[PDB]
Amino acid sequence: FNCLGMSNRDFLEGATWVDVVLEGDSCITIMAKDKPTIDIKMMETEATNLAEVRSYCYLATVSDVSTVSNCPTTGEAHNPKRAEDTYVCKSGVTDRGWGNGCGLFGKGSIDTCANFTCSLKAVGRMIQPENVKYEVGIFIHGSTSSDTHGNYSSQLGASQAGRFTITPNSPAITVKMGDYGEISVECEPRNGLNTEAYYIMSVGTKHFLVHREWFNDLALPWTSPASSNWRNREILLEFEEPHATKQSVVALGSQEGALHQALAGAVPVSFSSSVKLTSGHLKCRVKMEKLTLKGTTYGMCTEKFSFAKNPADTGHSTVVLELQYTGSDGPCKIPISIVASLSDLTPIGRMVTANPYVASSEANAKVLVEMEPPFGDSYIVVGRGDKQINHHWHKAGSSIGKAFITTIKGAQRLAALGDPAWDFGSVGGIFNSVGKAVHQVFGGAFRTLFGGMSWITQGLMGALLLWMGVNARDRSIALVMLATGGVLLFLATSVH
């Protein structure tokens, strides 16, 4: 629900609503002017009523083996066990003569049948769209300590957080956040997990989210959901060198390890009577027109503060600290700011804790304050006069470097989500409305031509496209190949 000690979160400036794409294990903080800063995150997604679509055998067993033999030129041997369904049969041919049995020399046909039993099977199930169940957490910053910022048994008890379920039946929900008002969100669970290009494959106790084509293409003996007879059983059987009267059959060993190797790249889920996975995305739209500030008329705290917990970098060019307040007065605003220097005390930074305050009247209160300073040397100032306490902070980056980082984050977000990435922080407008519509056609033209391809193959194909485009003429086909080769290399390096 809350994203402070989380590696990857995005920041979104505000005007009455904004649509976001809650990703797997990331979070979003939405800063707006004259609004409480709020964080929203998709904690997990779930399936509940899964129906079997297939089974695959990976440990088969041969029970009894028979060989019907015919003399040379007598025709083809026919084992009567070909009329029974649980028997796998194959026709071979063995040398026959006077020493073997028969009155003619040459290649006599034999028919060998072995009883097929399946010991262990991998079960592939599917998800109906009306059963996906997203868990979503929303939290208002408010006035928290460090031992309650992520508890949610205190955030819920202070009307500052909520976990709620998004279902295709009920794509929208409102949360009462106390004096902050109401926060609403309507999502797109149907446009969430594709749920029509995936199966849930269970191998023993390991459950995976596999593609439908891949699951359909396994070279293993398979069967219908309720059925018992198998097809393509000969994959797990070996008929050795033929013998006139007794040719043996061996079942191959368990393919569970080979299946696990094949599952490389699948997404492990945790099927415990209900599929639970913490990946994918969910596109939502949050309304905060009913979200208001709390305690607009507290006033400033008078007595001195302290750094109860030193300022710490959070990794997103943001700082967090915790102030202990000696004042025994009631709720009051915290006089805290980021300045370029302790002379010329004007604020230069923006604070994401949204007008902090000391929510209690009991003394020795502890308040977590979390703010984003600018690049270079800054001072965190709280208090005034003799009570003013200060802290020197330094931010290492630069604006152009941050622009490059944001550019590559956006490029790989387009890679991750494709078209829904154009709905990340959008406020409408023709620019996004046409960017989505052109990314759709370009993605189709790119996916019919380079889908189902690994990073090495696409990297080499892109390198060849660069070579060709440099040697290309007419300057019109050149740039197309340059763009495609750039994209293929970006994709090939985006995962290493």
Partner: protein, 75 residues
């Protein structure tokens, strides 16, 4: 992965069948043709590309086949 690295034809002289000779033709081609069937667009783009960087009909088909074989391998 051990199954991918396969003991090929044994150098021992053998007038019989090796361990898995029923799959000798398939095992070296099943995944390639399967991938091609799942990716016709790559087949078309590879055919188109083999014409670009060739210099005659002789050596364009060679490029086309080389691309059509190199992509199903290495996925």
């Amino acid at each position: 992965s051990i199954a991918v690295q396969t003991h090929g034809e044994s150098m021992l002289a053998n007038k019989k069948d090796a361990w898995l000779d029923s799959t000798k033709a398939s095992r070296y081609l099943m995944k390639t043709e399967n991938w091609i069937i799942r990716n016709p667009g790559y087949a078309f783009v590879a055919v188109l590309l083999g014409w670009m960087l060739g210099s005659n009909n002789g050596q364009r088909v060679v490029f086309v086949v080389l691309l059509l074989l190199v992509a199903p391998a290495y996925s």
